[PDB]
Symmetry: C5
């Protein structure tokens, strides 16, 4: 059976003439094909004001090393070892379109190497990634956030992203967003390789949101009623003023929460603006009739 | 008695052929059984909006090293030493379901080793850990937060979590949450070992929260009274407007504080929505009678 | 006179067989007695909502090294040297009950050693330390915050905290809190040594805070007057509504500022809740008389 | 074809007598001309209150090394290598006028070197850079933010910034700001070289912002109408009070959002101040007529 | 002319027997006189609530090394070199009274050394420094913030701060604060040397702030008028209620923005408290007359 001394001998022979900075290819004309695996874990939040989405992934990287091989029959059947992450060449994959907020406590600093040369490098990653958040169809809105990977500095004739396999690990249930992360995509080559996983997010219709929407709709009903109310009732100006106050309060309220960076504004805010405008016309008619 | 030179000799012989990256097992076919001890210290806060709980623990890790042993009679009865944490193999246990916000000033960077090979590694850990926070039965609500541990990269045929022993250290009294963290659980094996401690949290009924609840119930009494008030009293419309304003203010107020990510929304918020809806019907009846 | 070469020779001979990881004792059965000196500098703030106090200290640590000694007559009267902090054994004293937010720019990374073996290691420390904040007697409230020190990993039969000497350096004046940090306490031995300095904090009565009180008290006077006002004045309901609105606004206002984690809630908040309840009874009486 | 051994030999000969701290020039009297390339990627946000702009760039640095050269025919046609960033001399370019908030996960830590000595060093950079934000012509306002580069410590007789080439990479579309970053500028020599890229930012007129502006203009129309309303209508004081309340609410609202650091304040805020002042005069006239 | 080999030889001879931890003095009885140069760059903000001021400086440190000298005629006229900052003894100057928030990206990590031994060490430094902020004469207020320097651990018989030369670099114009930072001060010796630069800050009277102050004065005029209004006008109680509401809103508004840590509170806040108190007396008189 394999022993501690056997693994020590294997590692000592393995790292004899290894240069961490030289790409692991016998012939430097060949590229190293990297395939990345991005398994989402949890979607913490979708920050509307800052246009970010907070999530935790399981970014994995697989490639082939041609210098790190051995016949396992020569080393008591040792088929795999674990190396420190900083002793071996590692592709310079970056979270190109993201602010990476992972800590050193979430850095594994180790990798799995197989006797055929295949290396697995799996790392937890918490990302604050930019998303173009369009609140047009709020609150029945859908959105697309693309998580980008791009080789840092090696040209496509040196390092390439063969594929990106993205899935959802179903670790936790959201109850607010319906996430749809599935599919395989080849890498895109434009002077440096890069790929991206599309994340589709649909807001789930909760009874809490519809209960928060109920006051707005009934307020619209009340505006319609007062607009239809006789000018000579005598309470027109009073309740019109009070409900214009409340409507303006709701408009300010939504305005501080609605995203400012959208292809179009939200239909609901524009509809409440229209409501305020109609309330203004109702107040105008009431005062005009009052003077006349 | 043991001396500085004796301990120096022991350490020098001990670390002679130690490789930090090779699992500490004579036969590599055997697994290293790690038992983790997680003693909660203080529950700083339960953040509803961000779905996190802030706490400080005493995560301890115990395993057995087969290479680091000695007969203490051969070294003047030295029974235990202290080694720097980065010179010895350390299992790659991670706060899998948490954002670790500990500093390097909270890193001990040392471990205690016994002549039989047993290693103790105790470390303070401040965690921002994800919890599925359900505010259904607010404010008489209970919640369950699971703190996850999972070996990083070694397969179950290499490293396993034998057990997880979780307790409460009673270092401080909370006065807001009743914490119940006790029990022992074996590790779960699904391609990589992992375990979790269930934390049960019950909000304690404080005289302050019931005091804050008094305005709401008396507001309900007032709504009922005005709904029962004669249409021809003359104060119907005015008081309905003022108390609809107050109801909407309380609804907005709670809505900015209630969690948006819940299995069900909070009954109290839905009950205040019902209150506002009834106030709207009262206003509708008052205005209808006023016109007719 | 001592020279650069003399100090170089002394240091070279001093560090010849020094192991940073071996406790500095000739006989390992003896403990190293550490006496800590904690001189407060400034009390930045007392965060009520998060139950923290922000301050900057001058934590100093003094102990005795038995391996690092020399006869100064043998080295041209060199009586003291300065060593890098990471080359010498350092007791693992931790800010056990605090989040340490000091930077590496505030780390001295150097220590003073005397020819008798006595080492002084003084470091600035900015601490976010947990305090059980009771707002019962607000705003004439007092509080006690305990700053904890505890040896990290060495058992009491290896390392002990001999004493904790805490004082106030009077570097700056507060004008908001009266701080009382003075006294000497022996270390407490329960499986690992630890000590704590009790810091008493009394809010100073400022003319600004009494001014902010003035509206509340006069509002109470106004509530009493309107409660005494004749039911048949005709303005009862109007002022009752307006002042209940204002009362509820003040109640919400204080509620968002009062701590939620207290042994008892603040009497002033409960008194304003009683004021709101009395306003509700006044409104009830006014409407009842109005209908009847 | 070039091989791993060939690249190893080349690197070994290349770094034989290289000193990282000695400028890479045969004759030390000559300066090293650095040309910087700053390609903006995304303009995250323009923080008005803090006077910052958040963006992500592609800062590249190109210069010439005279010690690192080779005849490629002597090494099997190896024309370029990759070196670790910390083994070679690197110009000390700093984001002089900015808070750099990039992480170590966004640090490439490698550079591309060509057989002629030309080095390319491209790095992602997220900057929180100070801008003098003038909100005079709000919301039809334009602004100029200058991104500064300046050599850290070398005098102009040692290191110079030859040029700064700035462009927009069009990676993402903004939809809120029209960005205009294009042009080439020579370095400025005043005791230490430095250059800056001017960033012009124009707020795009969105249908959302005009919708938000509608309430204000109609409120002005209403103020004009009530100012023209007959003093003897009887409702003058009532609507004057209500609309002064609303005006003051809008004034406070904008005041908490308008920048406090401007060459001139925003005309719209001053116009709403004028509107409130006119409302005050209208209230004064109404009350004066009411008493008389 | 000097060459790369010449500088290499010079550095190799220079660092032959250099100990980074030994003060650079031939005779250890002499002190090293450090003169610091602190050139302010920009005053980002003056945070009233947290009592901090955010600024970026150009902290320079100059001293004399007696071991690092050479005759330049012996090395082809090399008159100055650049050394890595961590290879040479550096005085342990700390921003004693400040939170240093500089990044490693703003650390030069290099220093300029002259053949006479004079070393220049210039570094950008962004400081969050404590200031005793007195808002007595708000908004026509002036303030003094002292930036402290103090040697970390060396006694005055080892290291001394010869002088502190502070100036304003005029890099940017403020438009909100008039800064006056100029003058020279000797170091202060009380067991460890230290010095401080006094920075005077005067708020500039902006047309925006006076515009914000207009509502308050006109509100005072309105309070005076209603106090003078006939008790029997009929609008007394109504307008007193509405303007007491507005006064209380402004009082809360300013109270959340006024500093709580001042030698005296702000006169304007106390004046608005007096205004609210007078409004309360006016309301009291109106209601008293109404009942009687
Ligand atoms: C290494 C590197 C090369 C790059 N080339 C680039 N080339 C280009 O034409 N446009 C870019 O925006 C660009 N960005 C780069 C960023 C990095 C980090
Ligand atoms: C090392 C490692 C392996 C993993 N394998 C994994 N395997 C799998 O089937 N699903 C996962 O989500 C997964 N995550 C991993 C994460 C890490 C850090
Ligand atoms: C080294 C160490 C030992 C400990 N022992 C401990 N022992 C115990 O009984 N309760 C604890 O909470 C505890 N905490 C510890 C923390 C550390 C860091
Ligand atoms: C190295 C260095 C030199 C400097 N010289 C400087 N020289 C000067 O006249 N004014 C400055 O503001 C200034 N700042 C400097 C900053 C640095 C970091
Ligand atoms: C090295 C050092 C010595 C000190 N001495 C000190 N001595 C003293 O009498 N009072 C202090 O506050 C004090 N603080 C110190 C801080 C440091 C970091
Ligand atoms: C490693 O490189 C050296 C060159 O210094 C060579 O002598 C040796 O044979 C090489 N060994 C292997 C296993 O490649
Ligand atoms: C490298 O190229 C040579 C050229 O013939 C070829 O024989 C060799 O197989 C190549 N190396 C690999 C690993 O394929
Ligand atoms: C080596 O180990 C593998 C693991 O299952 C086994 O299948 C194989 O038979 C072993 N071979 C030898 C020669 O031990
Ligand atoms: C996810 O989206 C893809 C393409 O947009 C679609 O084919 C697939 O059916 C979707 N799946 C779910 C579960 O929404
Ligand atoms: C992706 O790459 C594979 C492998 O070469 C190829 O077969 C396939 O056609 C490519 N395109 C897609 C869409 O998969
Ligand atoms: C350590 O390993 C070396 C192999 O280089 C061997 O010669 C030596 O005997 C070993 N010593 C021990 C104590 O295992
Ligand atoms: C390793 O396996 C061999 C096989 O017989 C056994 O004799 C030995 O005891 C094992 N090692 C340990 C530490 O159990
Ligand atoms: C070694 O120390 C232990 C500690 O209690 C003691 O029990 C034992 O008798 C000692 N043995 C010898 C041989 O000193
Ligand atoms: C804690 O919970 C467990 C399981 O829910 C239960 O058996 C135990 O009695 C509880 N203890 C306390 C103190 O609530
Ligand atoms: C846990 O592991 C132990 C040790 O093998 C075993 O005896 C026990 O049955 C397992 N299950 C539980 C619930 O303890
Ligand atoms: C230091 O330890 C070595 C052991 O290798 C010994 O030979 C030497 O005499 C010791 N010197 C001192 C000063 O203790
Ligand atoms: C250590 O113990 C021995 C036992 O007699 C004693 O002689 C010696 O003085 C002790 N060491 C010290 C430093 O006291
Ligand atoms: C050594 O220095 C101290 C310092 O004051 C002095 O008192 C003492 O006389 C000196 N002794 C010798 C021998 O120089
Ligand atoms: C501080 O508190 C201690 C104990 O509570 C007391 O003895 C002492 O007089 C107090 N000093 C001041 C200045 O309050
Ligand atoms: C503290 O320790 C000292 C030193 O042993 C002792 O004299 C004293 O009695 C202890 N207790 C107190 C309260 O000081
Ligand atoms: C490198 O420098 C050494 C000086 O120690 C010299 O002997 C050698 O010839 C130099 N080699 C090259 C390639 O410059
Ligand atoms: C350095 O100066 C000498 C002086 O004549 C000149 O010959 C040489 O070409 C210069 N070096 C370079 C690289 O131009
Ligand atoms: C070296 O490689 C370049 C790359 O295109 C090629 O143009 C050139 O002909 C090659 N020369 C030799 C001698 O192989
Ligand atoms: C950008 O600004 C420059 C100078 O201000 C001008 O020449 C150029 O036309 C502008 N381009 C755009 C697209 O606005
Ligand atoms: C900039 O530098 C270049 C190169 O020396 C020079 O030709 C040009 O005149 C300079 N000025 C401008 C505006 O380009
Ligand atoms: C440096 O110190 C060594 C002591 O090991 C001495 O032999 C040598 O002469 C010294 N050289 C210089 C230049 O001081
Ligand atoms: C050190 O002191 C001696 C004592 O005479 C003196 O000669 C020498 O000049 C001093 N060193 C320096 C650098 O002044
Ligand atoms: C050395 O360089 C300086 C720099 O200006 C010059 O003034 C001096 O004449 C030069 N001396 C020699 C000997 O080259
Ligand atoms: C700055 O203040 C000093 C002393 O307070 C004074 O002498 C000087 O004239 C002032 N300068 C300015 C520009 O305010
Ligand atoms: C400051 O130090 C200098 C140099 O020793 C001295 O001339 C001066 O008198 C001291 N005092 C002042 C106020 O400059």
């Amino acid at each position: 059976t394999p022993t501690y001394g056997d693994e020590r001998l294997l590692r000592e022979k393995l790292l004899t003439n290894y240069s961490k900075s030289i790409r692991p290819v016998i012939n430097l004309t060949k590229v190293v094909d990297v395939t990345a695996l991005l398994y989402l874990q949890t979607l913490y939040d979708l920050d509307f004001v800052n246009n970010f989405i907070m999530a935790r992934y399981y970014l994995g990287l697989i490639w082939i090393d041609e210098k790190l091989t051995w016949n396992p029959l020569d080393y008591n059947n040792i088929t795999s070892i674990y190396l420190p992450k900083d002793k071996i060449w590692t592709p310079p994959i970056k979270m190109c379109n993201s602010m990476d907020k992972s800590e050193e406590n979430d850095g594994v600093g180790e990798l799995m190497l197989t006797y055929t040369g295949w290396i697995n490098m799996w790392s937890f990653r918490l990302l604050h990634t930019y998303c173009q958040i369009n609140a047009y169809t709020y609150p029945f809105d859908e959105h697309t956030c693309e998580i980008y990977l791009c080789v840092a500095l090696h040209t496509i004739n040196h390092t390439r992203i063969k594929e990106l396999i993205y899935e959802d690990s179903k670790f936790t249930q959201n109850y607010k967003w319906d996430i749809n992360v599935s599919g395989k995509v080849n890498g895109t080559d434009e002077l440096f390789s890069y790929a991206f996983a599309p994340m589709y997010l649909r807001r789930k219709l909760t009874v809490g949101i519809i209960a928060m929407l109920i006051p707005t709709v009934m307020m619209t009903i009340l505006t319609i009623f007062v607009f239809l109310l006789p000018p000579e009732s005598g309470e027109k100006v009073s309740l019109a003023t009070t409900i214009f106050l409340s409507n303006v309060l709701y408009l300010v309220q939504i305005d501080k929460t609605t995203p400012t960076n959208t292809k179009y504004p939200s239909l609901l805010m524009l509809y409440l603006m229209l409501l305020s405008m109609l309330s203004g016309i109702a107040t105008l008619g009431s005062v005009v009739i009052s003077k006349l």
